[PDB]
Design a protein around this ligand. Sequence first.
Ligand SMILES: [Cl-]
Ligand code: NA
Ligand code: NA
Length: 258
Amino acid sequence: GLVPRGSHMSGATEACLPAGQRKSGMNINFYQYSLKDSSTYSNAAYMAYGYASKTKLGSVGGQTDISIDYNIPCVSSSGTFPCPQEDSYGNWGCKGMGACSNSQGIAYWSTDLFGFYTTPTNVTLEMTGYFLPPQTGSYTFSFATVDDSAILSVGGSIAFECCAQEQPPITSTNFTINGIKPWDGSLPDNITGTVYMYAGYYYPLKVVYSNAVSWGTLPISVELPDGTTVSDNFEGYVYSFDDDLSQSNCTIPDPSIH
Ligand SMILES: [Cl-]
Ligand code: NA
Ligand code: NA
């Protein structure tokens, strides 16, 4: 037939064609989150949008390396150095450093999260931008682990609205990856999610990440239609556009027929 039929029951992911100046990387907004609060970040509403009701701490733009790997200090006999989580032992030391004199349970200040000075022990952040698929097909995003709670959303009206990257968060809880910390322990059941994407359309992407104490971890990857994996450094795939709420044609509700 002359035209493609379209994804069944209007099932294609919404994408966008912003007409403004494209900028490399994602924007990161930082919000207050309380030290040792193991409940707030277990709620879907909080992780989708409620985080923005807490105080905004600041922001950084243009971020292409988006994985998180925050290691608390070990105040050791040889100086103060970050301790890989898997090297921590006892009550407590860090392998190759001896015993640590400092508490694992206090807030720590660092620029490890995107160069922004804050407390990676206890914070929530929102990454926004647009993913640009180079190839049409199935993309599988993943979190290798999650310390402590995280979601990933892809698509217009799921991550955010087209041409409206900078707006307050939308209320969708239709997460592509639900890595929300379970109520009473365990890892979330599944930390991959798949999206079918058409080459050359800009797909809204939101990651919301929260930590309550100590180590923070969110190693982000995507497997491309050709079977290759991109991990941590998403340069060439992720972009930002300043809002243009007046660009009438920006939203492509069905890229499979556009
Ligand atoms: Cl040691
Ligand atoms: Na780590
Ligand atoms: Na943690």
